[PDB]
Amino acid sequence: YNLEAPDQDHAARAEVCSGTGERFRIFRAEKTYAVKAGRWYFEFETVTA
Amino acid sequence: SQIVLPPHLERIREKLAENIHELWVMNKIELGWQYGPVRDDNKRQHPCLVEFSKLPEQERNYNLQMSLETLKTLLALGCHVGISDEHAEDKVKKMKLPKNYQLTSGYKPAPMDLSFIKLTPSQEAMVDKLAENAHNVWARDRIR
Amino acid sequence: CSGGHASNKEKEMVTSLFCKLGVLVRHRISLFGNDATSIVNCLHILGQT
């Protein structure tokens, strides 16, 4: 009984799987620390990709 | 339930079931298994060692039903099957096995699958899927 | 990942088309009226594809 299988159907997750209905949380500094002049630098460490 | 079984699979299924029942009796034989009336695992006695004819009819019914469910799931996953040739079905020819490795059953279990037998990754994945499907059915039985 | 899956039979017949085009262009360049360079470029891009 040579069973002819269907071709392996490749499925792309494409951000469908996700928790709740809230998509992204935005983090920012306080409004009073706005910079109007000068040259400024800060770092962002990416724990995950 | 919506699945329908092709006639070659009905005709194959009964002796498939008896042969696989024998296959588990030999797997437990090579695991160290000596027949007995009571069903104790620690004592090592259990009535299911015997052939399909002396196999209790209620375990026989579950074996045939699980064979039918496995083949129906196989068709339900979209995997078609056909008859390659009548020769591979007719032949059960094998080199003789020692009485230590054999039971009183006459026909030798394993066919001549030395290197020619092979499962492609799709076949192995489908074997996996059948595994969790059987596990899910068993889990629903325990939930009931 | 969503689409663009070139069929295996499609790739097979693309290779067949490349082979038969290579056979056609062979031994018959003089008949073509200087578009043989265009045929060479076509065969080239077929090779890359």
Ligand SMILES: Nc1ncnc2c1ncn2[C@@H]1O[C@H](COP(=O)(O)OP(=O)(O)OP(=O)(O)O)[C@@H](O)[C@H]1O
């Ligand atoms: N669906 C089933 N149909 C028939 N017999 C079964 C079924 N499930 C278990 N059994 C029987 O019950 C006993 C339990 O052994 P089994 O092969 O299930 O695994 P086990 O290693 O003993 O572990 P567990 O305690 O998880 O069942 C065996 O005698 C087995 O033949």
